[PDB]
Amino acid sequence: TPVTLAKVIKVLGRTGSRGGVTQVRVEFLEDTSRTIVRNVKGPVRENDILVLMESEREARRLR
């Protein structure tokens, strides 16, 4: 199974109608040349570590 490892490097803020999901810029761990735009449902800090499945998916803005 494809377990992608992520590294929350930059916190962008909070989105969603409810205002809960964090917009986050991710430095890929295994291949450090990939920087993904990811959404997180949970409390995140800087230099964190996520576990994604589709590293080629990006997220502009949330309603």
């Binding site: 490892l5 449902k41 994604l52 499945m53 309603r63």
Partner: protein, 206 residues
């Protein structure tokens, strides 16, 4: 181990177990294994406690929560149903019983079994109910490691309590049962079920 005789002497089994560098009476934290890098620093428990009963004031800082013992954390997440609220002695004894079962379940390291359960039962990616205009579709998010561990311990304790209700089995046996069906995920546990379904609807919704 060089024993010491006082006037009122400490029982020999205590002295022996703790001067043999054993952190409980039947277990040790020096043998604990984490699989992902995301769980390493959010599950971390390297201080030996004999009771899994700490006056933790970690509810004052959000990340500070991740430095409170995971066995004490699963212990306080046992205490969920409204009738058992405000009873930590019950949960601690029950966890000690569970550990007495995972040993006699042909598993040499109950602590690594639990940690591997926590590693296996935390959902990688999830969904959120984002607007989209009335008919709210579900955006595939990627849940945090902190909430991964949270949701893990949650699904575990809840599945186990939901199983141990209205059946003769004691809570420790369905908690060991859950933690072992989830230690190495078998799709016979509640937590692996729900994790796989959350990641499945997260997959279908992207």
């Amino acid at each position: 181990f060089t024993p010491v005789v006082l006037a009122t002497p400490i029982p020999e089994e205590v002295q022996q177990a703790q001067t043999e560098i054993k952190l409980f009476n039947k277990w040790s934290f020096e043998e604990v294994e984490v699989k992902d890098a995301s769980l390493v620093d959010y599950v971390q428990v390297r201080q030996p406690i004999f009771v899994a009963h700490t006056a933790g004031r970690y509810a004052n800082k959000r990340f500070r929560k991740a430095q409170c013992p995971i066995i004490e954390r699963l212990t306080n997440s046992l205490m969920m149903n409204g009738r058992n609220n405000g009873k930590k002695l019950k949960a601690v004894r029950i966890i000690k019983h569970t550990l007495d079962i995972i040993n006699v379940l042909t598993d040499q390291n109950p602590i690594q079994v639990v940690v591997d359960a926590i590693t296996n039962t935390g959902p990688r990616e999830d969904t959120t109910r984002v607007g989209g205009g009335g008919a709210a579709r579900r955006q595939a998010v990627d849940v945090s490691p902190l909430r991964r561990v949270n949701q893990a311990i949650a699904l575990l304790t809840i599945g186990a309590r939901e199983a141990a209700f209205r059946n003769i089995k004691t809570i420790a046996e369905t908690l060991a049962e859950e933690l072992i069906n989830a230690a190495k995920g078998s799709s016979t546990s509640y937590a692996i079920k729900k994790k796989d379904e959350l990641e499945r609807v997260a997959k279908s919704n992207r």
